[PDB]
Amino acid sequence: GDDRELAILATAENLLEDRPLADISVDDLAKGAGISRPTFYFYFPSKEAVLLTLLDRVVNQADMALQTLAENPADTDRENMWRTGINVFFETFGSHKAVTRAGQAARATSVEVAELWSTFMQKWIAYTAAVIDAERDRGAAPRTLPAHELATALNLMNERTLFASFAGEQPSVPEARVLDTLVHIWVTSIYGE
Amino acid sequence: GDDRELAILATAENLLEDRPLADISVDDLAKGAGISRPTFYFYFPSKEAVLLTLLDRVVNQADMALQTLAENPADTDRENMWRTGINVFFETFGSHKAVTRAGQAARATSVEVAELWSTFMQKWIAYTAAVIDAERDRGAAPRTLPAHELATALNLMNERTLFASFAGEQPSVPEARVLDTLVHIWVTSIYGE
Numbered sequence A, B: 001g002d003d004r005e006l007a008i009l010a011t012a013e014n015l016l017e018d019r020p021l022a023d024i025s026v027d028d029l030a031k032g033a034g035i036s037r038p039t040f041y042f043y044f045p046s047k048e049a050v051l052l053t054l055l056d057r058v059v060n061q062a063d064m065a066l067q068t069l070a071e072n073p074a075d076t077d078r079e080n081m082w083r084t085g086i087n088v089f090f091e092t093f094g095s096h097k098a099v100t101r102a103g104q105a106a107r108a109t110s111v112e113v114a115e116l117w118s119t120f121m122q123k124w125i126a127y128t129a130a131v132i133d134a135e136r137d138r139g140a141a142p143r144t145l146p147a148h149e150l151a152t153a154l155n156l157m158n159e160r161t162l163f164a165s166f167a168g169e170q171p172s173v174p175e176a177r178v179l180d181t182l183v184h185i186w187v188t189s190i191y192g193e
């Protein structure tokens, strides 16, 4: 039953690694999942709903990993704290590059995908800002920019930079360098001046 | 003659301020430009070619303004130097928000638009890196990250952040705050540690 749903999702993630969603048909998803096309439409109204489901799984995986980190701080310096947090997104989305790239593109076309991404970005930015505010309250970071505006720009940088690296866009930071690059910019802008 | 081309371009820029390119027809562009549909196809093969032309004008305007700045340095501190450069893009693209937003979306669909954007981003990143390298050579900036990788991430941040602000996305930095926000992150990451 729901097994067939997971088969549809797995087939979609596999096919997205080699072609965009526009080049994938409902019949391709049904055929790969071992079901008929009418049976597919029982589980999903469209191939776009399949992508939205895949993206929802990935963003919730990242959100849950960040929540785990937040509840069990690693005893390290400040640079390591930020690196471990940025790494949650590097590893989670980097493990699902086809879904990430496809979900990014679908933001222009799908209001559901745009709303899903916006909801989680607001959550992650609020958490970033709250940690920056905590660092300021304890005297470790200077009161420079409004924390929420700083957090917004830094999170948007990570979105654009990580996704460019994963897609091998030109220009991009090589994926083997992108964590160090982002961590440097976060740490200097949060603690600097 | 070429006057009718400029009328097509002006009509397209005006219509894009109120609806996306998918909701604009070749007939809408012809009607607004005072020409017939066959006459339009003399000047442009498609409405997508009109957008590519509009975007080419905007990116070359920004590139030429940056070249002007590079040849006449303003006598100021380092923070003002970076602010004046970032402002070139804030003002140029912020004066053509509909074209910017439409060109951003067309990157997913149009290889010509993606290549145009990539060509100019590589140019602007190379210039950023060369200035960072100059600052390091004169002892003003520390040798931290590879300059070209730092320049890449900072330019990608500006792309994503400026365009989110112009479109009023949620989340975004308010447009009245985005220049200060970006300048802070550039200056601390270039001169910090």
Ligand SMILES: O=C(Cc1ccc(F)cc1)Nc1nc(-c2ccccn2)cs1
Residues within 6 Å of the ligand: A081, A082, A084, A085, A086, A087, A089, A090, A093, A121, A124, A125, A127, A128, A131, A154, A155, A158, A159, A162, A163
């Ligand atoms: O970077 C993002 C958001 C993102 C990344 C990649 C995307 F593709 C889309 C969104 N969120 C982050 N939060 C932290 C953080 C905050 C507080 C304490 C520790 N770590 C580090 S990175």
Ligand SMILES: O=C(Cc1ccc(F)cc1)Nc1nc(-c2ccccn2)cs1
Residues within 6 Å of the ligand: B081, B082, B084, B085, B086, B087, B089, B090, B093, B121, B124, B125, B127, B128, B131, B154, B155, B158, B159, B162, B163
């Ligand atoms: O920020 C960008 C690229 C960009 C911005 C907005 C976009 F929408 C798309 C690309 N380029 C910049 N170069 C400088 C600079 C470099 C050296 C000296 C002085 N200024 C400042 S900002």
